[PDB]
């Protein structure tokens, strides 16, 4: 996509409460005398229009992004405020007086905050603003400089959350007959990306508070000296008592943002708010079980942009292998590995049963999975197998050589691998291909790789998976609608933004965590498509699917996922609880009213790795 608008813009603009408190704070500050305003990171320009409507004499809005800047120019002009608001395509750090802005401003308004508060560089931007773009602070509001937000209190809480854990810690020491040795320590990219961002009010499986909430930091955005002192401030060593028995999985962080002395915003987890929380995963501990009487220790600092929580330990009453969170979720996906072990054993049993646990001829197995994979080690433990790994990273090879060694493989049993024959005049008995992206879409050129792979197979040899079924269902989801499009002008307090920003939406929502999404089912899930790697003649380009509507409702989306068939009996589900793949959905531009008992027709168009789903 050439012209992107980030998904969080739709969610935020749809949050009437957020828009109300920001407009209330700006109205109060403008009416009190702050007549010259600078909006840092204007987005659509909503805070600038609030300032001008409140009665500001001069409004300047700066926007880093070319796309957001151009959109903001059109929104402001459509709201008849072209003459009153001056939009600037620049980062606020590059603004010079009188070159870009003629005079120092009395009020800075900004929303350049993330779940961890500091992740968008609010400190660096406000230090530059106080030094070069703002009037002197208070010792009449027109005479002195002020910032919205005024201040913040940052909170933390130790939690048990199995959903976070399966993405940052490998939770088992034995997978599908293979041992994962102690001398190989797996760690996520958050180990020392200090935190991920999560909607903890709806996290799959939920979370449990193991401690009470605690203050981790405070910051005064109107205090330049306090802001400059952050770069060299020594970390704050804190000790938190444990109030509940449980597995320590993360420190969940949120903040209370004080816009002024009357108006405050909380990012505390709630299904009533749009705000996500900062999640600091707990890893590299000897024991994760914590009980009342224990103390959770950590070091909180904010010297180089991001808020950091380091040296996490529990105070009572070896090769390191960095993996992506998708690869850790993969190692924690037991049905995937057990399914692959059983499917590989059946191929070995049908082709060479004496090899299952020419004597010089091994059963050749190629794993073309993308990223870290242990499938070649599982294959090697099964029989007289010559397995090949496609890992690129040197650290991954070392780890796999140590895993191979722990599974009694003599040196160079496992080898590291364009699709070609194992050896000139030799054929593969098993080829594993990566068909579904973690995004929930089909991998690019998979049909082409399958066609090339089929020519390299021994008679009776198999490509894994053999075929993939795409499943989908009709849903009424107001949540998917509000994360895809701004719902009117009432949400944006009379301002016309929705028609202009809604144009930058994409038809397919990827990386969807379907189980955490509030949905009303309007149909039962049904097979939409068959992607056959062993028998492409069974594929269909153009198909109409008649979906029985079980329940009357407003159809807003068609979520979809897959059943990957390793053979006729063994299938993997990309929507399963332990799945390391995310799902996806076709979200409708205009929701359709459907009635119980009708057969809705979906048009499913398949060309190579593309699938188009529309209501016919
Ligand atoms: C530093 C800077 C940024 N920019 C521009 O402004 C925006 C930066 S902010 C990034 C998104 C923040 C959303 N945070 C919401 C949130 C918070 C907490 C919890 N949950 C959320 C949810 C769940 C809702 C995402 C962006 O348009 C940039 O191009 C600037 N332009 C001019 N000069 C500058 N110095 C800047």
């Amino acid at each position: 996509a050439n012209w992107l608008v980030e998904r969080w813009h739709f969610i935020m603009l749809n949050d009437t409460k957020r828009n109300t408190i920001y407009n209330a704070a700006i109205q109060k500050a403008v009416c009190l005398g702050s007549k010259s305003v600078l909006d840092i990171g204007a987005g659509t320009g909503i805070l600038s229009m609030f300032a001008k409507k409140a009665g500001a004499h001069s409004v300047y809005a700066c926007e880093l992004s070319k796309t957001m800047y151009e959109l903001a120019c059109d929104v402001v002009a459509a709201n008849k405020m072209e003459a009153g608001i001056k939009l600037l395509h620049t980062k606020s750090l590059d603004i010079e007086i009188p070159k870009h802005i003629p005079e120092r401003v009395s009020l800075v308004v900004t929303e350049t905050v993330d779940a961890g508060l500091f992740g968008e560089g609010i400190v660096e931007s406000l230090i530059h603003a106080w030094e070069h773009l703002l009037l002197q602070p208070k010792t009449n509001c027109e005479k002195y400089g002020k910032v919205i937000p005024a201040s913040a209190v940052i909170f933390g809480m130790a939690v048990e959350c199995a959903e976070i854990r399966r993405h940052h810690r490998v939770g088992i020491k034995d997978i599908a007959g293979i041992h994962l040795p102690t001398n190989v320590k797996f760690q996520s990219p958050a180990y020392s990306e200090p935190y991920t961002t999560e909607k903890m009010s709806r996290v799959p499986g939920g979370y449990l508070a193991l401690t009470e909430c605690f203050e981790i930091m405070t910051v005064d955005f109107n205090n330049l000296q306090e802001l400059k002192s952050l770069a060299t401030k020594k970390p704050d060593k804190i000790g938190i008592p444990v109030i509940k028995e449980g597995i320590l999985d993360a420190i969940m962080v949120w903040f209370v943002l004080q816009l002024d002395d009357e108006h405050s915003l909380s990012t505390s987890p709630s299904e009533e708010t749009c705000w996500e929380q900062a999640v600091y995963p707990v890893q590299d501990l000897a024991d994760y079980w914590i009980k009342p009487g224990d103390h959770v220790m950590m070091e909180v600092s904010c010297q180089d942009c991001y808020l950091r929580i380091q040296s996490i330990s529990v105070l009572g009453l070896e090769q390191t292998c960095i993996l992506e969170s998708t690869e850790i979720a993969l190692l924690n996906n037991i049905p995937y590995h057990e399914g692959f072990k059983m499917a590989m054993s059946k191929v070995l049993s049908s082709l060479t049963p004496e090899k299952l646990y020419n004597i010089l001829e091994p059963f050749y197995v190629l794993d073309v999975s993308e990223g870290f994979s242990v499938l070649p080690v599982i294959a090697g433990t099964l029989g007289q197998v010559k397995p090949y790994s496609s890992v690129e990273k040197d650290q991954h090879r070392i780890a796999l050589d140590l895993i191979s060694e722990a599974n009694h493989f003599p040196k160079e049993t496992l080898e590291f691998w364009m699709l070609q024959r194992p050896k000139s005049d030799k054929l593969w008995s098993i080829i594993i291909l990566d068909v579904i992206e973690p995004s929930g879409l089909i991998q690019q050129e998979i049909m082409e790789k399958a066609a090339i792979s089929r020519c390299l197979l021994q008679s009776g040899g198999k490509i894994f998976p053999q075929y993939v079924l795409m499943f989908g269902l009709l849903v009424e989801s107001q949540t998917l609608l509000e994360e895809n499009a701004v719902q009117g002008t009432e949400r944006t307090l009379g301002l016309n933004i929705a028609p202009f920003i809604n144009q930058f939406q994409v038809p397919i929502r990827v990386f969807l965590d379907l189980s955490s999404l509030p949905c009303i089912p309007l149909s039962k899930p049904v097979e939409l498509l068959r992607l056959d790697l062993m028998t492409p003649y069974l594929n269909t380009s153009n198909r109409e699917v008649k979906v029985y509507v079980c329940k009357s409702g407003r159809l807003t989306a068609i979520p979809f996922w897959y059943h990957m068939y390793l053979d006729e009996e063994i299938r993997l589900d990309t929507s399963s609880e332990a799945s390391h793949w995310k799902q996806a959905a076709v979200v409708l531009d205009n929701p359709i009213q459907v009635e119980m008992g009708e057969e809705l027709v979906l048009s499913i168009q398949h060309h190579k790795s593309n699938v188009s789903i529309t209501v016919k």
Side-chain angles (χ1 to χ4, degrees), residues 1-16 18-27 29-65 67-79 81-85 87-100 102-123 125-135 137 141 144-145 147-171 174 176-184 186-191 194-211 213-215 217-224 226-227 229-233 235 237 239-243 245-260 262-264 266-290 292-303 305-307 309-316 319-321 323-341 343-347 349-351 353 355-359 361-369 371-391 394-410 412-417 419 421-422 426-448 450-461 463-489 491-536 538-545 547-557 559-568 570-576 578-594 596-607 609-615:
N2 299 348
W3 306 287
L4 159 93
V5 163
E6 302 69 24
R7 197 160 295 279
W8 51 78
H9 291 293
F10 300 96
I11 308 175
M12 290 194 286
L13 285 162
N14 264 337
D15 205 78
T16 316
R18 184 196 72 82
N19 299 337
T20 302
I21 299 148
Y22 267 98
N23 172 255
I26 295 169
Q27 223 147 43
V30 163
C31 295
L32 282 195
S34 294
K35 302 293 164 61
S36 52
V37 186
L38 173 66
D39 188 352
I40 298 173
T44 61
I46 185 146
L47 303 185
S48 291
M49 293 191 286
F50 285 161
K52 189 69 206 180
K53 275 182 85 169
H57 299 146
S58 56
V59 187
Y60 306 94
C62 65
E63 178 47 67
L64 192 144
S65 165
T67 302
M68 295 311 296
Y69 163 76
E70 284 178 11
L71 175 54
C73 288
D74 295 333
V75 173
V76 165
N79 282 277
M81 286 184 229
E82 331 84 347
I85 304 158
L87 295 112
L88 303 151
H89 179 214
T90 178
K91 184 153 191 169
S92 62
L93 307 176
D94 303 311
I95 299 178
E96 297 184 313
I97 297 164
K99 204 184 173 195
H100 308 111
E103 287 180 350
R104 276 177 184 265
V105 301
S106 53
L107 175 64
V108 156
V109 190
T110 193
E111 275 206 270
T112 56
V113 301
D114 73 336
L117 180 66
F118 302 102
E120 299 300 327
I122 188 149
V123 172
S125 299
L126 294 182
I127 290 172
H128 172 271
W130 275 116
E131 279 174 0
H132 297 104
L133 311 172
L134 270 159
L135 289 160
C141 287
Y144 68 84
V147 175
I148 296 164
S151 65
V153 183
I154 300 81
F155 296 91
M157 186 169 81
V159 302
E160 177 183 283
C161 189
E163 184 62 14
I164 290 160
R165 185 198 316 145
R166 75 185 183 92
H167 287 97
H168 299 273
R169 310 204 292 258
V170 177
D174 292 89
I178 77 161
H179 201 77
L180 294 180
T182 302
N183 58 2
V184 181
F186 297 111
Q187 305 295 156
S188 87
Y191 171 79
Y195 56 89
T196 62
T197 179
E198 197 65 35
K199 193 74 168 64
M200 292 298 285
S201 58
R202 64 195 197 197
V203 60
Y207 68 87
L208 292 161
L210 304 174
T211 68
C213 60
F214 51 90
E215 185 191 284
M217 197 192 169
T218 74
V219 56
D220 191 359
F221 295 126
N222 286 304
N223 194 333
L224 174 58
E226 190 173 312
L227 293 170
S229 83
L230 291 179
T232 53
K233 194 189 168 96
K237 293 174 177 184
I240 307 307
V242 178
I243 69 144
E245 239 191 20
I247 300 150
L248 180 61
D249 291 323
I251 309 302
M252 179 179 65
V253 163
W254 68 95
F255 57 93
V256 179
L257 200 70
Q258 213 65 41
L259 300 196
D260 57 39
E262 290 196 334
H263 306 109
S264 67
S266 187
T267 67
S268 204
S270 176
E271 277 292 276
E272 285 147 274
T273 60
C274 74
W275 311 115
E276 282 173 4
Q277 295 65 55
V279 170
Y280 295 80
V282 174
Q283 41 191 316
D284 204 20
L285 295 188
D287 190 359
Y288 298 97
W289 190 259
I290 65 170
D294 288 341
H295 276 270
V296 183
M297 327 269 89
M298 68 204 78
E299 292 198 31
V300 178
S301 67
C302 196
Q303 300 170 0
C305 192
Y306 300 117
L307 167 77
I309 300 176
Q310 291 172 327
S311 311
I312 305 160
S313 75
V314 185
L315 195 73
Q319 182 72 218
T320 291
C321 186
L323 300 181
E324 290 302 309
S325 275
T326 301
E327 295 167 332
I328 294 161
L330 170 66
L331 295 186
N332 286 317
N333 186 352
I334 307 311
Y336 173 99
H337 292 96
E338 263 158 20
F340 262 106
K341 176 188 166 77
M344 291 190 286
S345 300
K346 288 156 79 179
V347 179
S349 174
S350 75
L351 290 183
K355 288 190 192 309
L356 188 65
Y357 297 154
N358 172 0
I359 202 86
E361 194 84 290
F363 193 87
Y364 289 100
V365 174
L366 179 63
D367 184 24
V368 205
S369 290
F372 194 78
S373 181
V374 293
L375 292 185
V377 182
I378 291 154
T381 62
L382 286 175
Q384 211 212 311
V385 172
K386 172 47 69 172
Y388 280 88
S389 162
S390 294
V391 296
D394 281 80
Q395 198 181 54
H396 288 186
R397 296 194 171 104
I398 295 146
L400 283 170
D401 278 352
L402 291 170
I403 291 158
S404 294
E405 188 181 311
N407 287 286
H408 321 282
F409 290 5
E412 301 182 328
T413 295
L414 165 66
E415 272 179 84
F416 300 90
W417 192 251
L419 300 152
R421 285 170 177 258
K426 296 302 159 72
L427 296 166
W428 298 104
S429 313
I430 296 174
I431 305 167
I432 305 153
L433 301 175
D434 203 308
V435 181
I436 303 306
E437 279 181 15
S439 67
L441 300 184
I442 295 170
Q443 289 273 17
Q444 176 182 33
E445 285 163 8
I446 189 56
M447 288 194 37
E448 289 106 306
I452 293 160
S453 293
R454 209 176 188 278
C455 300
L456 307 170
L457 284 174
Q458 190 130 262
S459 185
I463 285 166
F464 286 153
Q466 279 189 69
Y467 64 97
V468 176
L469 302 181
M470 174 177 79
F471 274 79
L473 90 154
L474 307 178
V475 304
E476 175 176 321
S477 177
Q478 187 61 21
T479 302
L480 280 173
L481 185 54
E482 292 203 26
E483 297 180 350
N484 214 61
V486 175
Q487 298 299 295
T489 69
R491 312 291 191 107
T492 54
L493 316 175
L495 299 171
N496 197 24
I497 310 171
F500 316 106
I501 187 167
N502 290 351
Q503 295 181 107
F504 298 82
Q505 190 50 261
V506 68
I508 303 115
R509 160 75 159 104
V510 294
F511 291 101
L512 181 56
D513 194 41
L514 194 40
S515 68
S516 79
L517 177 72
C519 277
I520 300 164
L522 302 178
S523 78
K524 282 184 201 300
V526 80
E527 187 191 318
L528 300 170
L529 172 120
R530 181 196 186 95
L531 168 70
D532 212 308
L533 288 79
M534 286 296 293
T535 323
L538 291 179
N539 293 341
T540 76
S541 295
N542 192 338
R543 187 150 97 97
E544 294 194 356
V545 173
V547 186
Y548 185 76
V549 181
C550 289
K551 186 182 184 154
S552 298
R554 191 168 40 103
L555 168 69
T556 62
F560 62 88
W561 62 96
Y562 315 86
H563 286 187
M564 306 188 81
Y565 279 84
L566 304 183
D567 60 39
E568 299 299 339
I570 303 152
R571 65 145 199 253
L572 309 178
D573 188 350
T574 75
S575 78
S576 69
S579 172
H580 59 285
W581 297 272
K582 290 299 190 195
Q583 305 77 45
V586 170
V587 184
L588 305 181
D589 273 38
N590 301 109
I592 299 161
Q593 185 52 42
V594 296
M596 164 192 272
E598 89 175 274
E599 279 182 350
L600 199 73
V601 178
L602 298 180
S603 168
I604 293 109
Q605 303 310 305
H606 167 223
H607 184 92
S609 302
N610 195 67
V611 186
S612 163
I613 303 156
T614 55
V615 179

